[PDB]
Design an enzyme around this catalytic site. Sequence first.
Site, PDB file in Angstrom:
ATOM      1  N   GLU A  79       0.777  -1.191   0.000  1.00 55.48           N
ATOM      2  CA  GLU A  79       0.000   0.000   0.000  1.00 55.48           C
ATOM      3  C   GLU A  79       0.824   1.263   0.000  1.00 55.48           C
ATOM      4  O   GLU A  79       2.065   1.238  -0.112  1.00 55.48           O
ATOM      5  CB  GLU A  79      -0.986  -0.047   1.163  1.00 55.48           C
ATOM      6  N   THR A 115      -0.059  -0.183  10.847  1.00 57.87           N
ATOM      7  CA  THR A 115      -0.107  -0.264   9.413  1.00 57.87           C
ATOM      8  C   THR A 115      -0.121   1.137   8.739  1.00 57.87           C
ATOM      9  O   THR A 115       0.255   1.255   7.554  1.00 57.87           O
ATOM     10  CB  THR A 115      -1.355  -1.031   8.974  1.00 57.87           C
ATOM     11  N   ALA A 160      -8.566  -2.587  16.139  1.00 56.25           N
ATOM     12  CA  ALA A 160      -9.924  -2.531  16.680  1.00 56.25           C
ATOM     13  C   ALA A 160     -10.561  -3.946  16.621  1.00 56.25           C
ATOM     14  O   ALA A 160     -11.298  -4.343  17.579  1.00 56.25           O
ATOM     15  CB  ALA A 160     -10.833  -1.429  16.047  1.00 56.25           C
ATOM     16  N   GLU A 161     -10.195  -4.737  15.591  1.00 57.08           N
ATOM     17  CA  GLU A 161     -10.633  -6.142  15.533  1.00 57.08           C
ATOM     18  C   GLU A 161     -10.094  -7.015  16.644  1.00 57.08           C
ATOM     19  O   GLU A 161     -10.538  -8.178  16.755  1.00 57.08           O
ATOM     20  CB  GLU A 161     -10.259  -6.792  14.184  1.00 57.08           C
ATOM     21  N   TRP A 168      -5.929   4.181  11.706  1.00 55.18           N
ATOM     22  CA  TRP A 168      -4.962   3.602  10.821  1.00 55.18           C
ATOM     23  C   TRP A 168      -5.163   4.161   9.390  1.00 55.18           C
ATOM     24  O   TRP A 168      -4.677   3.617   8.408  1.00 55.18           O
ATOM     25  CB  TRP A 168      -5.075   2.099  10.831  1.00 55.18           C
ATOM     26  N   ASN A 224     -13.680   1.983  14.130  1.00 54.35           N
ATOM     27  CA  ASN A 224     -14.849   1.376  14.666  1.00 54.35           C
ATOM     28  C   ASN A 224     -14.667   0.938  16.092  1.00 54.35           C
ATOM     29  O   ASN A 224     -13.583   0.626  16.485  1.00 54.35           O
ATOM     30  CB  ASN A 224     -15.142   0.144  13.881  1.00 54.35           C
ATOM     31  N   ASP A 262     -19.047  -2.455  11.367  1.00 59.08           N
ATOM     32  CA  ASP A 262     -17.635  -2.156  11.189  1.00 59.08           C
ATOM     33  C   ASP A 262     -17.363  -1.023  10.147  1.00 59.08           C
ATOM     34  O   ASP A 262     -16.483  -1.122   9.256  1.00 59.08           O
ATOM     35  CB  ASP A 262     -16.884  -3.433  10.841  1.00 59.08           C
ATOM     36  N   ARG A 285     -16.398   4.934   5.192  1.00 62.34           N
ATOM     37  CA  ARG A 285     -16.861   3.561   5.011  1.00 62.34           C
ATOM     38  C   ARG A 285     -18.382   3.476   4.984  1.00 62.34           C
ATOM     39  O   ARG A 285     -18.930   2.694   4.226  1.00 62.34           O
ATOM     40  CB  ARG A 285     -16.355   2.660   6.134  1.00 62.34           C
ATOM     41  N   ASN A 343     -12.862   2.496   1.288  1.00 65.00           N
ATOM     42  CA  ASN A 343     -11.903   2.056   2.249  1.00 65.00           C
ATOM     43  C   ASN A 343     -10.674   2.991   2.296  1.00 65.00           C
ATOM     44  O   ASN A 343     -10.823   4.232   2.119  1.00 65.00           O
ATOM     45  CB  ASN A 343     -11.517   0.586   2.021  1.00 65.00           C
TER      46      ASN A 343
HETATM   47  O1  PQQ Z   1      -9.145  -1.060  13.183  1.00 64.96           O
HETATM   48  C1  PQQ Z   1      -8.045  -1.587  12.883  1.00 64.96           C
HETATM   49  O2  PQQ Z   1      -7.126  -1.634  13.699  1.00 64.96           O
HETATM   50  C2  PQQ Z   1      -7.840  -1.906  11.429  1.00 64.96           C
HETATM   51  C3  PQQ Z   1      -6.578  -1.911  10.817  1.00 64.96           C
HETATM   52  C4  PQQ Z   1      -6.499  -2.116   9.430  1.00 64.96           C
HETATM   53  C5  PQQ Z   1      -5.090  -2.124   9.008  1.00 64.96           C
HETATM   54  O3  PQQ Z   1      -4.351  -1.936  10.004  1.00 64.96           O
HETATM   55  O4  PQQ Z   1      -4.735  -2.423   7.832  1.00 64.96           O
HETATM   56  C6  PQQ Z   1      -7.730  -2.345   8.547  1.00 64.96           C
HETATM   57  C7  PQQ Z   1      -9.044  -2.314   9.350  1.00 64.96           C
HETATM   58  N1  PQQ Z   1      -9.000  -2.089  10.702  1.00 64.96           N
HETATM   59  C8  PQQ Z   1     -10.413  -2.498   8.708  1.00 64.96           C
HETATM   60  O5  PQQ Z   1     -11.502  -2.470   9.392  1.00 64.96           O
HETATM   61  C9  PQQ Z   1     -10.414  -2.726   7.208  1.00 64.96           C
HETATM   62  O6  PQQ Z   1     -11.493  -2.877   6.592  1.00 64.96           O
HETATM   63  C10 PQQ Z   1      -9.134  -2.774   6.397  1.00 64.96           C
HETATM   64  C11 PQQ Z   1      -8.924  -2.964   4.983  1.00 64.96           C
HETATM   65  C12 PQQ Z   1      -7.543  -2.915   4.837  1.00 64.96           C
HETATM   66  C13 PQQ Z   1      -6.909  -2.970   3.494  1.00 64.96           C
HETATM   67  O7  PQQ Z   1      -5.943  -2.227   3.340  1.00 64.96           O
HETATM   68  O8  PQQ Z   1      -7.405  -3.501   2.499  1.00 64.96           O
HETATM   69  N2  PQQ Z   1      -6.916  -2.675   6.049  1.00 64.96           N
HETATM   70  C14 PQQ Z   1      -7.822  -2.579   7.096  1.00 64.96           C
HETATM   71 CA    CA Z   2     -11.725  -2.271  12.104  1.00 63.52          CA
END
Ligand code: PQQ
Ligand code: CA
Lengths: 70, 70, 597, 597
Positions: free
Chosen positions: C55, C159, C176-177, C243, C261, C303, C331, C394
């Site tokens: 990315e 990230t 957050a997950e 993030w 979220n 989410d 989102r 996103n």
């Molecule tokens: O809340 C978090 O800590 C967190 C981190 C990240 C990440 O660190 O890449 C994503 C998400 N959430 C998330 O909800 C999400 O849909 C997502 C998509 C991606 C991606 O780059 O395709 N990263 C992340």
């Molecule tokens: Ca998330």
Amino acid sequence: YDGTHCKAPGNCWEPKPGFPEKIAGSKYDPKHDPKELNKQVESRKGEEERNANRAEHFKKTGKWVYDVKK
Amino acid sequence: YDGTHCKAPGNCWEPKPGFPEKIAGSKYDPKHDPKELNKQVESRKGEEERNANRAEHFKKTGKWVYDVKK
Amino acid sequence: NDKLIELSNSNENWVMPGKNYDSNNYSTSTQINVDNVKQLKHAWSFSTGELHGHEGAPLVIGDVMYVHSSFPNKTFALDLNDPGHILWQHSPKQDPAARSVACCDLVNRGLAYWPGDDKTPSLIIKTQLDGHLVALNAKTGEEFWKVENGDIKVGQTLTQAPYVVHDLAIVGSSGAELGVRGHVTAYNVRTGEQAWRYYATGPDAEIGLADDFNSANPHYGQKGLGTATWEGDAWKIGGGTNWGWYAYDPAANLIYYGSGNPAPWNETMRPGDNKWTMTITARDADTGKMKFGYQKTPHDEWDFAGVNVIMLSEQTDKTGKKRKLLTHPDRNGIVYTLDRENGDLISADKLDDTVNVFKTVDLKTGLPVRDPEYGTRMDHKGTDICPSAMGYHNQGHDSYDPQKQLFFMGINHICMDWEPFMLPYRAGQFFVGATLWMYPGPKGDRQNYLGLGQIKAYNAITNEYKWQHMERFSVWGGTLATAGNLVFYGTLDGFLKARNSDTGELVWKHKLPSGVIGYPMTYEHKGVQYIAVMSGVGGWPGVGLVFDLQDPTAGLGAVGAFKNLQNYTQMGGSLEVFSLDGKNPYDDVNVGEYEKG
Amino acid sequence: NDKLIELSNSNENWVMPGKNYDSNNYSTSTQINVDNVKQLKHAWSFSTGELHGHEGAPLVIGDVMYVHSSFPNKTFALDLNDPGHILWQHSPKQDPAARSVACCDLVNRGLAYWPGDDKTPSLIIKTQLDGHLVALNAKTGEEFWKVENGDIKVGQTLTQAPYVVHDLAIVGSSGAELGVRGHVTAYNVRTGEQAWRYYATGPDAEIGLADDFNSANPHYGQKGLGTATWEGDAWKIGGGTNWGWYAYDPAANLIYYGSGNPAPWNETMRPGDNKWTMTITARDADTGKMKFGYQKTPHDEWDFAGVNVIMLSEQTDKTGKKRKLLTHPDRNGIVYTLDRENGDLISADKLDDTVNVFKTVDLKTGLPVRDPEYGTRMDHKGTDICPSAMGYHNQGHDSYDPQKQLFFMGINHICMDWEPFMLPYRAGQFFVGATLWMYPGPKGDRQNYLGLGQIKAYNAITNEYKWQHMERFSVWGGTLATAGNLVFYGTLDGFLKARNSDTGELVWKHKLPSGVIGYPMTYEHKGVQYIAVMSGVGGWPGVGLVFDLQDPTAGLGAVGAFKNLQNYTQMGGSLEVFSLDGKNPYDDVNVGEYEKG
Ligand SMILES: O=C(O)c1cc(C(=O)O)c2c(n1)C(=O)C(=O)c1cc(C(=O)O)[nH]c1-2
Ligand SMILES: [Ca+2]
Ligand SMILES: O=C(O)c1cc(C(=O)O)c2c(n1)C(=O)C(=O)c1cc(C(=O)O)[nH]c1-2
Ligand SMILES: [Ca+2]
């Protein structure tokens, strides 16, 4: 619950038809364990201490030493 | 040993100044273990058997089944 | 940082994530344009030696290009006069168990840069999946400092790209997950010392509210809400991680980002508005005090992680008031515009009419009107909910053209079904609590699982879409607008495409190695304009591909939605450079020759 | 296989490794040539989703391109009319412990093809690092059959491309560095049944000598030598694996390949000529009987693994006799030419005058004259030995232009120091027994560790080099000659280069993602000539890079010789396609669009 009925500004949450205002005591009770809940606060005290330790050593010698057991 | 002196056609090996014609019995003796030496011959008997088993099943049903325990 | 402001004024440089403090991904370069784009060809490429999502986008400071890879977050410095010679490389050693707590692929969104003084070297600032913020001497690649800013044992990782404002490096949060409560910190780039750190939930002091927080819009909410809109201590493992992307206003001294979220995904496990999560946030760059805060998604049910990009502009609104503004495609399906000084909500437009979780967003009250039929709750399976959890937008960093006053948005068109389940919290495990099924939305091919993206040009004030095209996959990597009347974006199926930015006409495209989830960027080196973008599919949409999953509900539901992407791309990892006629230093065959004669 | 012969006559196809049974990597295509090569641009690319060395080169059968990756040996079928759509994919599951017995990187040299009948589908034939030869239905990618042809528990693996002759698939062997005794087998592509299998050492019956073996050159050696030139049973773990390239004469019915080095590397542990190893070998395609056999390196002392490419031609020799010939540039520094019908040795020329292990190769006796000062033995460290064990030539598949009668050779310029040591044999462990130090040879930069390749054009009969250029790294991937007066080859530093094949002038080059160790290939699809080559550094020269080694003696000595390669490339894995003006199906922007309107 449509989000528009607010007991206060910034505070419109309502439970949904058939679900309670409070979950504690219900079949939705999460029963979180406070030890667990605090884990991150503890973990961050260590990071901050070791960090503070590494900047202060840096201040004084002009070289960053990551591993704080020096 | 320059490779040009041949006791026979296709067979010119000589030992070098200070090294023996035979190594068996010397400090260069490899002392190979015959069990080890034969390992590959054994391994290939299994491959050939399982292979033969898979082609013959294939011949008969028109479908290759790798895992010979069928 | 005024030096960054000035270097961003030069087309020979791209000095921060999103190019400038407006975060608008716009280049005034005209050398490549609607009238010669068919002449655009490949100039060179560089592979990173890593697979998985790649990315973000490189930085360019004069003669040096800096690129960054997926885990383990290698940094490389390339010599634009001979880009095959690597000036230097930084290769972190990280515990490989960091992989196991990354929700959505080993991705990283990029590097920032601190231009030095006479006492101190310029510095490349980077994050590591294992929680560290590291500063590198930007000419040698040697460690300058390394601070801990995330413990994987409590579910945390990094990230995002970090960000430099003044002599400060700002860093966000992931997990957050995994129940992580969102935190944002500023460290001092000279000393490596922490300058301020604030949270997205709990007592106000810990969140860092300014005394006059939301004074211009008190119906948004003011004191005590990061605890009042929770039950008991459920805020402590409450989410709100940030993030995504930053933006900065030098005159207001305010940095803008959105918080993510709340946790878990099971809404029944946390009654309440779950404040400070899902919030558009403005903090004083230097003290980090929160000036204002607009919760887009009260009590998230989907989410809809509120972390998306934020684009700054100056326009005249509908009443004639010349305004300083932020624009922010979420989102949740809603693209927001706020006056960036006070919070005044100006526009809140659906990203596509298919959005159904809300009937509308009332501008006066600023509340989203909920359609209760598309919400989520325990013992219920919600069906045909749009947007899905992957959002109608996103982490792709979009562009805004200030000449046309148009925003160019890479959109997702993914709906979902959703059923939560009860789970305990255990620090360092996942803390999700739902099972999703995702698929293309109404305007795509729901039977055959194609048609998951759109690209659209949008005016924040009149609320109109000047043009819209469907795309086979979600347009996940953001876009790049230029003064040559072209917008550029990569696709998850591996094209760099260029449309005419006035009309949306597709006018050029090229098959890269792998799908794209970074944004293209541009710079001029020796009077040649180059367009560069990272190739290497992954991130959330790539999880089925990247980890070989087939369970449609795996990867948090993304596996079923993208089952087809792998018919169009595999993993990769590289930077791909383009220019008029493929002009490039190797046009001189002796550049980089051992013989040279 | 006459159908293969015929499809090889079409420029729209590249149907076997090395393009045709001559194995000469020559295309009569003129559409790209000395006069427009500056117009060559990037057309498209495809990443494989794997890192590590990517060797060999794709196949093209009409509209389908087939590509193959590093371990785990994925096969993919790409649609030339829309190469971003993957027609199909084969992804083997293999035990990952196969990695641990691969001496010199997880590489694989490519696919072969069996054109089908009315009863049976056409088939793609592939090898797997874990020992299997697998046949795939070439239109669907479904397993047709899978035979075991290497057990990793006894140190064995497969890295070569296999080869199709008649209705036979021929497969070689790897592991001389683990004491494996070289074996070559033919399986029947319709039945999956073994047709013949022969060995490189031991009793004649097991080696498969023809009754009239070497009758035209009996001074080479005839009966009983695969045991007489050993002591006791040391032949059983004797090496001779054949992991290089094949060639085939339809009229003589003979396939040619060279067998590898004897084991172990410690010469003191195996007195004797070590016959059948190091041997240029001609076997009846159908019974597999060995017609003739020329040992280039009696009693190997240097790991000069005799597996290099073999290029067939018809020329008039120096006495006026019109001959049918094979030409064969060896690790040992000697490029050989033999009459391919009887074995008659015609030329044996040093690849560079720096070669010193031999004073010369006597043509009458066919013996190499040894310089005892550059040999190896126990309790001695040999110094400044040229070539090194990596050879002045390795596995790169070169080209021959039959119009000019010139061979285009990518050469290595790597010398060495070498000390053996005593070690036991244990099946499934390494069985090397030496410690090497390698560095550039005399004409390169020995202090700074650059200057390890050359590229040269050579006539097998007059013995002359028409031109020679030094190259920063070894030219390891082979080369491609065409009728447009151009030769093309990839470099380990990541360029595809084109020189004028009459003069060696460098006229074009382009920065690929990663270093190249596969050969470029060419084909015409809808009247457009494309030049394609695999990018992704690795193989032996990449081992320090690829596994992060720094001990100069690690990777069997390659680590020290290549310490600098990683300043110029990282790992990658992709196919890169080029053509005049970058012409490519996406020139039509709607090819591969979901909207298409
Ligand atoms: O809340 C978090 O800590 C967190 C981190 C990240 C990440 O660190 O890449 C994503 C998400 N959430 C998330 O909800 C999400 O849909 C997502 C998509 C991606 C991606 O780059 O395709 N990263 C992340
Ligand atoms: Ca998330
Ligand atoms: O004898 C063997 O079994 C064997 C196998 C291979 C291979 O399988 O790649 C190489 C070698 N030997 C070898 O000696 C060697 O120098 C070598 C270089 C490479 C490479 O592609 O760069 N492979 C191999
Ligand atoms: Ca070998």
